[PDB]
């Protein structure tokens, strides 16, 4: 039981750390995700205000 | 069982179901707007037992049903179970039939369009009326009071209206639609109940609790000193029997309820109360308009038939309103079931029979034509 | 006899087993629930003596018998012994072979799977039944009784469990299971026989005490006030012969055996009774249903015999029960029957033929098929 | 024994209580909310032997004790037991007389008044504190979680109350109370090991269903595909030791136990849920609100530890939430005691020592006045 | 031990199954930002190119 909880334990904390590995990954996709939803939204509505105002001429 | 093809009139509210026919001074029968449906797995065989209950039935078989209102707020949503309670109304309950009766249905000026188009609906495709007529409770509300000049105050269980009319016209940029209602007073009561030490959370507590606050609540005309000694004493106190025997003492929350009317935080809502609506309607008014709409706040509607409540409402109006003008507030015995008198006398108008859609006008435009046609 | 290829009916308890054709209203055929072994060795030849006694014969040569149940506080613990005595009970007494005829079964719904799932199985596999169905001792008690609403005390012989119906729908999380019946009752009578100085342990003892069970005993309306008499007067004893022609007089044991019923704790069991698991599954039940289950609560199985039950019984339950409310108890001659003479109106129902297990789809399952068929 | 004059923080509730001092980040006196009382005749003298067991020694001696829990539902119902809890917990476990150490008390929202102030009393009179405060739990755990905004689901043993806090500011007009808690989820699990033959129902069988629930219960995130093969195999299953070394074999029990969470029928409560509870609490909240609760659903207290409970609610929140809307649940590892912890936080902050009622205000107003002061 | 390893095998298996449920959001946040990318820069900056154009004239 002493290697058994070792072993899990290991993978448990090892596992842990690939939870918060996917996690931060995770959350700085989401930033990522954020910053190119923002630049697409920005980009679309840059267009799209310029193009109101510019839709005449 | 009608000798005449009168048309049928009907009031289909969050809470109750009036109905009755065009030419009568009230409606034949008074109702609930419920489908009830078993909560439960059946274990006898030949019990017979129906997938849904309506109205009377939905209440008295309510121990294993959950009971749901198809109307909500004064939007109709459910249209299948609504469907089931005007067959109820119509054939169970008057002993008619929309297909023989031109049908008028009503609701308040700034209710969502989607209300009037599904009951135009219904009423033309699954019963098969020859004329539809969407009215607005408004209208209804100053015909049953008897005035062309007043604000109407509908505070009953789905949404409160506050809309000035003048001279039979109406003022819409005056009309105060609040979220302030008898539907949420019984749930608040549920709460202040619980507080209490008697927890009400389900439907046949709802429905309990919807009992005390019919036959136990008022408002009063000063709520502080009434809340001070209420508070302070049991000779304010009154008891209510439960269904199942219990007994709860009730002290300050048979009137602190109803007070929401006036203060609406005590729900959360962000609103100075129904007097403050009532004023502002008038107030955004021409001045040769408001001394006439002052001199008639009109009770419609329940809650309004609360003691206190007229004197409670004219009294904070007129502290709002200026000297030498005359505020008063209108409160026929007739409250509650006004609007459906209104849609007796709406129907049975001579100058009101062109105003019916008819079923073939409706067929040839579907349902969005009540949008143009009623008003 | 039988003309028609009726669906049998058969309850079976840890007590007896009730038999008949469905359709009437009494079983035909009434056995112990009872295989019976002789513990001797045989010294005369020719003279038959069987291996195993099923019913009335393992109580008719029980002098040298040991005799054993196989249903223990609700469940069959011995399938072997229960084909015996269905096979004596149906085709030697009954004169029926259920290869011809659908057949109904019984167990309360708490009553753990494995005994349906064995009903099932013997009737299927050793009698080739054409079909099954397993009934809930509750619905069959409600049909007996002429009820859809109540709650069934099924204080049987092994295991009480107070199951509440309304309007036919099972209230399950309701059903407050007791470990206590009337074969717990015989063993508190055996102990306290032994302390008036008549040990009763072997097997034609054990027969003796429940017999005396059966025929002396009474709860007694007062429990106190009863025993102050009866522990003070000889005038209350009563006198039991015993199969030897000696005879056994019991005083306030009389009553003390059956008050375990109000008393568990006379056999060491953490509950008030019987009439406090009535209480609880009506106090769990919704709200707007206490009221049709307080007005009809039902005693079914056996232990409600005693004639001072009937008392007692209302009385403990109004005592906890609230007020303005009518409290009832429904004390049936179809008692210690009832659940037979339920199964006959249940199986009998043409609304019933529909709920039949086929062997076909038996055998295509397996036997938990009935865990997804009956209920 | 400790070496400041700090409160006491004391979560008492239908389960467990976790006792400590302000300014700690853990319990240091952990027990079950239990008195214990003997159910036996004893024979031996000189045995000792208290009239009444507390905690852990009700727990140590159970196996002749009839267990009780002094407080239900939220509430204290028994508070002379709670002074034996509170006496043992101050006194021989945490070693600290309450008069130098003010003490908070924990409560939902709803709770009813007279437990508030039942509370007060008993630690003004009883133990002479020099102060009091009764704190709301959804408080203490948004201090815990570092948060002043989210939702608080609070899903003990007792109620789940489903509350929402904005900017530090109650929003009570969508707190839904929900009677669904731990304690049914261990009466539904006895219920089904019923079914699978193994029957609890006394206080030795009700502590170890309570402790079966704790070890192998979880929800998973898809409750049909998890039950498909937990029911068709035994690789779902997992095997429960009870205290005399036999054992329990539970399968899909292990999971319809905690899914009646999701699904309130299984124990006849008419409710959606705990995830819609949640989703109203949001939904009922202003429209500008709404977007922050949801970023914000905090899981406090007790089953908040059933394996798959934190994405299985973000998942059904998310299910019900309008889409681009980002819903997140906050579920640290200090899952549970998260209301200890912002008892200590709120105890000892600085901004909060006006808070405290003092025995000064306490005997001029009564023991009423906690529900003026504290909130 | 016993114990100490079914709860370091129930934080292996929640970290497993943690990890799962990561591995499951990584690969939605990997497919997320990806999609998020290939439509809105590619949409975007396509719209971008049509600025080029759309604003030629």
Redesign the interface.
Known sequence: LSDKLKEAETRAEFAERSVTKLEKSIDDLEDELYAQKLKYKAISEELDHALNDMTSI | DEDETTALVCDNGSGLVKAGFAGDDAPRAVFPSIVGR??????????G?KDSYVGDEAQS????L?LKYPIEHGIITNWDDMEKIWHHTFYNELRVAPEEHPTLLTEAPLNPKANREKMTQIMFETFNVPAMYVAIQAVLSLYASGRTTGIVLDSGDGVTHNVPIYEGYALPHAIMRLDLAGRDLTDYLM?IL????Y?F?????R??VRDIKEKLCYVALDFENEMATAASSSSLEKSY???????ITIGNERFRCPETLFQPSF???ESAGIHETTYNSIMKCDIDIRKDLYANNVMSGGTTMYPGIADRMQKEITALAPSTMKIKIIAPPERKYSVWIGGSILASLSTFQQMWITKQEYDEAGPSIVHRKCF
Chains 1, 5 share one sequence.
């Open positions: 078993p909560r439960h797995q059946g274990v006898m065989v030949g019990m037992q078989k309510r121990g294993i959950t709460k619980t507080e209490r030490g927890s959370v389900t439907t046949a507590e429905e309990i029997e439960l269904p199942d025997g219990q007994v729900i959360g809502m």
